[model samples]
Target: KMFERCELARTLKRLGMDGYRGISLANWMCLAKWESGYNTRATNYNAGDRSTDYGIFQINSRYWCNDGKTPGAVNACHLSCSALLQDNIADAVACAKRVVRDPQGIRAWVAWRNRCQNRDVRQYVQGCGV
Candidate 1:
């Protein structure tokens, strides 16, 4: 499920990603672009924490989804990490929403901090009609 930029933008907007927790759609787009390039099957392992970041938004096994092998991990979204890898993004969208409820908000994703925060990210949604 590799997504084109505008294709993903429209989908996220329909999923209520616009201004969810004060974060804009472009911010979400930026995060997805930098983190996993909008690929639903993307997974990144953290050798340091023994956890993996799953799916489009790179939700982590350490705190979001349970991968069964992440030591001392908490499944805040109460879903299997495999659920995040599906082509249908509904569960992934729900899990992504849960992640920002934390104190750190969107700052939970480092890519958001370095690439999106305080930046003019509108280009991400440009021509997408989102």
Candidate 2:
């Protein structure tokens, strides 16, 4: 989980916040825990509906995929959605990074982290991995 979050944070920094911001590694780590249990193959818990949130990054096909034609297509650098079964860590991280780099892309994440702090999710944001 720690490793994944660290990678995600760095990727976000490089990708140019399209849908995310320059959030800290701590913030990313906590989100990973809550969102997908750090499992690349984690899926959504819709139960009756049972929608899948593919890959270690837990991305849904509806939100991302080869639709952008980002070279790799489903197997693109960002993994999008098609690469879910392929376990494309690099691609997933890259795609997520691009999203967060957006001016307000990570707004949801940022808000989440703030709320976590207020609710004592962790002693401090830096303690996210703990």
Candidate 3:
């Protein structure tokens, strides 16, 4: 499913995700844009390791999700990686919360590190007024 940036920002705010691990809603939206372009069905395969990143947050199959055929995958979210590739992003949010709680924090997302960190993204939700 595709989401308008404002719509996604509003929904995410309503989910009480505005200030996750000190990261702002704008930064989150910025990360989402760069990672998946707000497309829920987005999936990227890593040719180097045969791993995959799924959904808007790009959760990795190696640790956070199960791909069924990836041997020794931790499956920390206890759900199929494909499950994230849907409009319902609640599971993805829950799993992402777990990820942010780790030492790396939001840096788990390389896009966030290289593209969103310290970047002023207030415009991402400017009109939403959240």
Evaluate residue 103 in candidate 1 and report its C-alpha lDDT on the 0 to 100 scale. 94
lDDT of each: 0.93, 0.49, 0.88
> How close is every model to the real structure, measured as TM-score?
0.96, 0.52, 0.95
- The per-residue C-alpha lDDT of model 2 at residue 41 equals 65
Superposed model 2: Cα runs more than 4 Å off? 1-20, 45-51, 66-80, 85-88, 108-130
Which predicted model would earn the best lDDT?
Answer: 1
Instruction: Tell me how far the alpha carbon of residue 67 in candidate 3 is from the true structure, in angstroms, after superposition.
Output: 1.1
Taking all chains together, the TM-score of candidate 3 against the true structure is 0.95
Sorted by lDDT (best first), the order is 1, 3, 2
User: In candidate 3, what are the lDDT values of residues 18-59, reduced to their tens digit?
Assistant: 998897899889988999999999999887777899999999
Candidate 3: minimum summed lDDT over ten consecutive residues — where?
Answer: 68-77
After superposition, which runs of candidate 3 have C-alpha atoms over 4 Å from their true positions?
Answer: none
Give lDDT tens digits, candidate 1, residues 67-130: 8999999999999999999998999999999999999999999889998899999799999987
